[PDB]
Amino acid sequence: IRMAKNKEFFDALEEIAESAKNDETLRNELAKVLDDILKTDPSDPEAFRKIVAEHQEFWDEHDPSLMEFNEGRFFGKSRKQYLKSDDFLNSTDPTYNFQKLHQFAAEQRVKLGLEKSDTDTLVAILKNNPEECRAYIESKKPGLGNFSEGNVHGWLKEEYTPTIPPKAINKSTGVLSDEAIKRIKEQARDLLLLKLINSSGNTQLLKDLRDAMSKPEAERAANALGFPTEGNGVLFLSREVVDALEERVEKLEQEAAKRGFDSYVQSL
């Protein structure tokens, strides 16, 4: 058991995002909830408790436990009072405080937008370094969130690395940490691999990836499938990608057997 609902809201954001993977209506609803959280100053605990509680209708549709107020404990407190206390959302939480919830929300908002993003954006996430990634995410507004000054609290002014042309960089590590960018790249990796797998008809190449026994072997196959070498640093085969690989090879082999049979059954 944990004090207050802080951790439950963390896990709820992830699990609702999961349920939104193929539910476009829920995606838009969750995007608005995340957008509202991100525009709120997490060092203003009253404004932050208020923006979370203001979406009670949304939270109730997914887990009534988040907004549940058992008047058995906290008996001297009304519901309106509880929703403003640390017993609802603990601002001094050692682990899941409002700053961490804000930072988590920024990462989820990007991943939410990545889900249906095109190939080129997945590749851009893998090719850009973390500073470049933050600026690129701003460039995609609002597809990956409204990451811009005044619309996400603490988002910094865009800077530039003096190449020709200047490359946009953003140093808002207090909003999207380097570790959040790393997990964003891991999700982009999986999303892109799944696209390349579905588009490929090269059964042997897909088998080479499916049967890879080491990272160099996986790199050679994935790169031949179109995965960018700039993503090799984060290349790791996850459960979902392995499962897609097995099913795709099986489908291609069934289809190949149905044709090789017919090219023979009416031939002779």
Token pair for residue 72? 């058995």
Evaluate whether 200 touches 225 at the Cβ level (below 8 Å).
yes
CA 188 to chain CA centroid, nearest Å: 8
Whole-number Å distance between alpha carbons of 56 and 177: 28
CA distance 59 to 204: 46
Selection from 137, 223, 221, 212 nearest residue 176 by Cα = 137
- Give CA 50 to chain center in angstroms: 25
Residue 145 bridge partners (DSSP): 143
Host H or E run for residue 238:
none
The whole-angstrom separation of Cα 76 and Cα 204 is 68
Decide if 51 contacts 36 (C-beta within 8 A): yes
